[PDB]
Each structure stands twice: as structure tokens, then as C-alpha cells.
Amino acid sequence: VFXSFXXFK
Amino acid sequence: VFXSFXXFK
Amino acid sequence: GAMGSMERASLIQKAKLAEQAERYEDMAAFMKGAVEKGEELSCEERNLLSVAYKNVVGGQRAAWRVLSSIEQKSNEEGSEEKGPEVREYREKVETELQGVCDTVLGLLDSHLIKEAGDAESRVFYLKMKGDYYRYLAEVATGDDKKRIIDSARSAYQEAMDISKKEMPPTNPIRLGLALNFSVFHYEIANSPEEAISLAKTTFDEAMADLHTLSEDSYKDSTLIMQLLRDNLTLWT
Amino acid sequence: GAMGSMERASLIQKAKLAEQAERYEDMAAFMKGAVEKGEELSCEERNLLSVAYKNVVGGQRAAWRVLSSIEQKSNEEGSEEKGPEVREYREKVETELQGVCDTVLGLLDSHLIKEAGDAESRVFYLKMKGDYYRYLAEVATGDDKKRIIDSARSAYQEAMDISKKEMPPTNPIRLGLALNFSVFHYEIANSPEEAISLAKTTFDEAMADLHTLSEDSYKDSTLIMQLLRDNLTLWT
Ligand SMILES: [Cl-]
Ligand SMILES: [Cl-]
Ligand SMILES: [Mg+2]
Ligand SMILES: [Mg+2]
Ligand SMILES: [Mg+2]
Ligand SMILES: [Mg+2]
Ligand SMILES: [Mg+2]
Ligand SMILES: [Mg+2]
Ligand SMILES: [Mg+2]
Ligand SMILES: [Mg+2]
């Protein structure tokens, strides 16, 4: 699966 | 929207 | 072509892998290569061809609609001028969409349709020809728009004539053909009454033939009948 | 480059349009062109770059995993030999994925990172460098696998050191960096205890700083904190 994070408000 | 149909069993 | 060195069977195998990977551009390129080997396509192979290009052109059509909507609003009263970028990028997507349609139409014309003698193959390919002229029609604005529309109509019409003579009213290709010709009438040809009449007659003639079918064939036919009903509910 | 003739501002405008159209390959090409203009990127522009390539590489990674799984099963006891096609097509996708990673790493090295002096930009770019080496690590099998892993680790580590010195514990870039470094530890470096410890400490230090934030900043921070918690729940 995907447990990551990449576009911040 | 899409009301059409294209891969038959 | 870049697939010229690959075996036909390997291209088909890789098209199926690309479908599983949701790599539809690859899938279409593999099936284009398979068609260019020059042999007729089996029923399963025809399905792979249609699925591949349906998904490629489907992404392009969805993008074109987003961009066209943005472009139209920029042309509203009171919209601030933002320059040529929206039009340019809509044109880029439109040109790529037309190129995909032209590729599919070229495969049908060279030489899938002329070699297709059985009703199931010939109707399948003529339906595709109508579909891809219809996608061209969706974006057409110039002095060939009427000829593009008439090309879609003529392909659909030849397919309908064969399917009525040679296929039972529940045949899934016959049903999906009628569905899409009905959408053509409603969305492209400005003939909503023709669209409604065709969808209703197609649905009713299929219903009356369902008793002849196996459970599996019944499932295949009723699925597409439900799409005819969904359109009728939207349109009436 | 094919974007060399387009204005920087037009490339940025078209990247935003491509995002709305879900045309992420176009979006990445537009942002690559914008970076190649040679000016630093703003906060919003950095976001566009990361979103574009995240989506491009995300499709490739998902396809690679599907194909790799098929390939592994074909290597099972009792699996019928089907020839080289699965391996060949997995290799094709893998090569294209590596090419995208190399492109991103090349933009960071020429010359985004060296020109980035503010903590927010430098940490953002170093996180990206770790991420794209991590994607390379996911498919690496040869005699450079260890060096690829160490390259990801070193970029993440430099980013962590800066973010701890220069950013509050609730900063969303600091939090997403720690999240992804934790995933690196768990999935790539075979260090699940390090992964768990980092995720727990990051979460707890953020929780204790939430009181300092506005409602909008609180929403931004707690969203990424929830991803740390989700991983901890999966891993413990
Ligand atoms: Cl453009
Ligand atoms: Cl291949
Ligand atoms: Mg041969
Ligand atoms: Mg104004
Ligand atoms: Mg009426
Ligand atoms: Mg009639
Ligand atoms: Mg300029
Ligand atoms: Mg056997
Ligand atoms: Mg332990
Ligand atoms: Mg520590």
C-alpha cells in the first residue's frame, strides 16, 4: 500500500 | 457524463 | 513501427499484462502492433483493441472537457483576460485526441473492416468506426464538422443494418451498438426523439428475446439493457 | 528542451490547468520546463512540481508492482513457462520509472538544491531527493542497491537535521518528511523499530505544539499526524 505523503495548502 | 458502452465477456 | 520486431503472440500477451497494470497507452500500442501483423483478430483480441483505445481516448476526452469548460468561462462577460494559454493547451489535448482517433480509424480502414466477413467482426469494427468519428465530432468546429458527423452516422447505420439481419436482438454487440448510436443521435445529431425511440425499441425487442438465453448470456444482455434504460430515464 | 520557447509564467499556468485536467505527464513536463528557466521556485511552484511527479511515478510504481507480482508467481513451483514477456514488460516499466526518478533527481541537482537557502525550500527539495532515491531503491536489485539506499538515507538525514533546527514540530513539511523517512526505515532499510520510534516521537512532539496554531494550521498539521498514527497502527 502507500503510507507516505508528498502539495501543502 | 458517459451513456455509452465499448470488451464483451 | 516500433512493434514490428515483436511476435504477434507476445504483443497480445503484453496487451493483457498492460491491462492488468492499467497501462492503457502501452496496451493500445501493443494492440496496434498486433493489428499491423496483418492477420484477422479473434473475438478476444478485438475486445483488447477496443478496451485499450477506449481508455486512452477516454482520458483525453475527459481532459478536453475540463479545458473546454475553463476556456468557455474565460469567454464570459466580465472574465479577466489571461492570455492564450487556455486555448493553446485545449488545442494541444484536442490535437492529441484527434491523432488517437485517426490512428484507430486508420487501423479499421487498413485493413480490419475489409477483411471482416462474419457479422460479429464486421459489426464490431463498424461500431468502432462510428464511435471514433463521434469522438472527432465532439471536438469538431470547422467546415468538416458536417462530414465528420455524416461519417459517424454512415458507419453506425451500416452496422445497424447488418446487426438487425444477422444477430439476435439480445446480442451484446448489437445492444451496445444501438446504445451508442442512440447517444450519437442525442448528443451529436441534435435528434433526441430518434435517440429515445431507438433506445426504447432496442430495449423492448431485447426483453422479448431474453427467454431464449442461458443464465450467463442473460447476465451479459441485461447489463447493457440497463444502460439503455438509464439513458431513457435521463432523457425522459 | 521542448519547453524552452514558452514563458515561465505560461508554463506555470499550464501546469495548473493540467492538474485540473488530471494530465499529470503534461503537468510534470510543464514544471520541468519552468525549473529549467533557472529561477528559484516559490512555495506554490514547489508544490506543483512535487504533485506532478508524485502522480507520474505513482502510476509507474503501481504498474511495476502488478507486473512484479505476476513475474514472481511465474517463478513459483509448478507454474507453466510462458516465455520472456512478463520479465521484458516489467523491465520496460522499470526503466521508464528509473528515467522519471533520474529526471527529478537531475532537476534537484541542477540546480534547485544548491540555490535553496531558506529552510522551507531546502528541506522540501532534500525530502524529494530522499523520496526519489527511495523509489529507485524499491526496484533496485544489483550491485548499486546499497549505494541507492544510502543516497536516500543521506538526503532524508540532512533534511531532518535542518528541519529540527529551523522548523516547529508541527510544520507540515517537517511532518511529511518524518513520515516518509519512517516509511524508508520500515520498507527499504529493514529497520522497523527505527520507523516506529521516529513516527511516535514525531507525532508526540507535534501534539505538544498544536496549541500554538491557528485553526487552519491546526487542520494542516493534524492531517499529516493522522498518517503517522495510521502507520503506527499498521506496524504495531
Ligand atoms: Cl500547450
Ligand atoms: Cl516490452
Ligand atoms: Mg511470428
Ligand atoms: Mg476584472
Ligand atoms: Mg416528442
Ligand atoms: Mg427505426
Ligand atoms: Mg520570459
Ligand atoms: Mg503444467
Ligand atoms: Mg521491539
Ligand atoms: Mg532519533
Numbering used by the authors:
A (entry chain A), B (entry chain A): 1 to 9
C (entry chain B), D (entry chain B): -4 to 231
Q: Can you provide the manuscript's text about this entry?
A:
As a selection target, we chose the hub protein 14-3-3, which interacts with a range of disease-relevant proteins including p53, Raf kinases, and estrogen receptor α. Here, the combination of large library diversity and non-canonical amino acids led to the discovery of high-affinity 14-3-3γ-binding peptides that utilize β-amino acids to facilitate a binding contact.
Among the 14-3-3γ-unique sequences, seven contained a C-terminal motif: (β-homoserine)-(β-alanine/β-homoserine)-(4-nitrophenylalanine). The non-canonical 14-3-3γ binders were found to compete off BiExoS with IC50 values ranging from 78 to 530 nM, suggesting that they indeed bind in the canonical, phosphopeptide-accepting binding channel on 14-3-3γ. As an additional means of characterizing the binding interaction of non-canonical peptides with 14-3-3, we crystallized 14-3-3.12 in complex with 14-3-3σ. 14-3-3σ was used in place of 14-3-3γ to facilitate crystallization, and retained most of the binding activity for 14-3-3.12. 4-Nitrophenylalanine6, which was selected along with thiazolylalanine and 4-fluorophenylalanine at this position, makes hydrophobic contacts with Leu218, Ile219, and Leu222 of 14-3-3σ. We speculate that the β-residues conserved at positions 7 and 8 of 14-3-3.12 provide the backbone flexibility necessary to accommodate these energetically-important interactions, which were not identified by selection from peptide libraries based on canonical amino acids.
